[PDB]
Amino acid sequence: MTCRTRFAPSPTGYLHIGGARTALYCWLEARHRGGEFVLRIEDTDRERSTQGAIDAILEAMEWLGLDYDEGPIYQTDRVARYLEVAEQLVADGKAYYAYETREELDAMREAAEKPRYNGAARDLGLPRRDDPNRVIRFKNPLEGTVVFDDLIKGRIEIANSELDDMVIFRPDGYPTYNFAVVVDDWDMGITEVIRGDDHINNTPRQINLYEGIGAPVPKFGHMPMILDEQGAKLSKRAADVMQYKDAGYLPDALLSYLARLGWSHGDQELFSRQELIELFDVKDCNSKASRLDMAKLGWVNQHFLKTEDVAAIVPHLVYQLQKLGLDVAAGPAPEDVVVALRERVQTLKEMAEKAVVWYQPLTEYDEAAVAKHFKAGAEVALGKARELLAALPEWTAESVGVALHDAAAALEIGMGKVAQPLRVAITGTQVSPDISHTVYLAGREQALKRIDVAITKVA
C-alpha cells in the first residue's frame, strides 16, 4: 500500500556523496508519495562500522535535512532474525548445509566457463554439524530466467544458469549481504528498492530469494554511479558530504545539484527542496551516468545564496565565521553580512573570509591602495562623510547610504570621490562590496574611528 523506501549504507567512515544522492532519491520518492523513509545501518562488519563511522552518517543526514521516519535500524540487532529465516528455509527444503573448503571452492576455478558454485550439496540433505566451513546455501532455481522491470533501467533479464546457490549464512555466524538485505527489506515492507547500479546483478539473486521465502517482491530502481570530472568512479581521492559543508555550500543547493545529477524535469535546473518533493518520480531518473561538475555546483550555490531567505542562510554563515575564530557578537549582525555579500560570492566560506574586515580591528593597509586614494584632497570627502555619518540618528544600511549620497551632493562630486577613499578607510584595500554596506557593516564606532585614521594618513 504505502510507499516505503530505505537508505541502507554500510559505514565506511563518512557519507559518500553517492550515498547522499541515494538517500536523497529514496527520501524524495517517499516524501512525494506520502510514505515512509527507513534508515538501516549495515553494520555487521564490527571493524568498519565503528560508532564514529555511524555518527558520521547520522550527522551528514541531519546536515542535509534528510530526516528518516524509521531507524536507524542496525543489522547487528537482527542476528537471531536472520538465523531464524535461514534455518526455516533449510527446514522447508529451500536451503541446505554445505561444507566445502575454500580450496575446494577455489578448485572450482576451472573456467573453460563462468565461475559459480557446483550445487554439489544441494540435494544431499546434509545435517548441521560443527565445522569451520559450514555454510547455508539457498536453492536458486535451476532453469528459466529472472525478469524484472527496473524503475530506472527498464526490463532486465538474467539466465538462472548464470546464478548459483548463493551462500546466505557464513561460517562466522553472520548472514551474507544478499540474504540480510532481503530479510530486512521484507521485514520492513520496503516497496521500492532504490540503489546504485553496481548492485544490479545481485537483484535477480534477491528476487529468487523473495520468491523462495514467499515474500512479495518489491520494485527496484538502479541509478548509475556518480563519476568525477575526468569520468572515473568517484572516491575521496570531493567525496565526503562534510567536505561540502566545510567548503561553504548550502545543503539545499547541494541537494538541488545532486538531484539534477541523475534526474531531470524539462529544462529546469534549480529546485527548492519543496519543488524536489513535488516533482520527483524515481521513474524519471536518468539511466546514463553523469559527471561531477564543481563549477555547476558553485553556480547552483550562487542561486540559493541569491534567493533563499536570509535567515535560512545565516546559520551556515555563522558556522564559517566561527571557524575563523571571530567574535560574531562584537561585529555586524550576520544577516546584514549576508545581505551585503550574498550576490557577490560563491560559498559561505568565501563570504566569511571576506567579512573578516568587519569583525576585527583594521591594522594592515594595502600600500598601493593608500597611495592611490589617500592623496592630498581626499580628506575633504572623508571629513564630509565622517561628519554626515556621525550625525545619523539611526545606523542602518539605508541611512548610511543617505549620508554618503548627501556627502557627494554637498560637495558636488561624483560618488566615486567619496567611495574610493572611504573603501580604503574601512577595509585598508580597494576591494569591498557596496560602499554603503561596507561602511554600515563596520558599525558606527568603528566606521568613525577608521575614517579618522584615514584622514591622518592623507598625504
As annotated, the binding site for ATP includes 236
- Can you give the three-state secondary structure of 64-123, one letter per residue? HCCCCCEEEEEHHHCHHHHHHHHHHHHHCCCEEEECCCHHHHHHCCCCCCCCCCCCCCCC
DSSP conformation class of 357: G
Residues marked as binding? Answer: 236
The one-letter amino acid at 58: L
- Closest C-alpha to 417, from 426, 428, 407: 407
Calpha distance 146→160 (Å, rounded): 7
Can you tell me the distance from the alpha carbon of 48 to that of 41, in angstroms, rounded to the nearest whole number? 12
- Compute and round to an integer the Cα radius of gyration of the chain: 31
- Single-letter code of the amino acid located at 400: V
Spatial distance between the Cα atoms of 166 and 136, rounded to a whole number of angstroms: 8
**Angle value at C-alpha 381, between 379 and 385, nearest 5 degrees:** 110
Q: Which of 233, 236, 283, 306 is catalytic?
A: 236
Q: Which helix (H) or strand (E) holds 43?
A: none
**Residue 236 is among the residues annotated as catalytic for this protein:** yes
SS (HEC) of 288-303: CCCECCHHHHHHHHHH
CA dist 455 to 84, 260, 261, 382, 405, Å?
84, 53, 54, 7, 19
**Angle of the 443-457 helix axis to the 378-390 helix axis, nearest 10:** 160
Q: What are the start-end ranges of the H helices in 188-333?
A: 203-213, 241-246, 251-262, 273-279, 294-307, 310-323
> Could you list the active site residues?
236
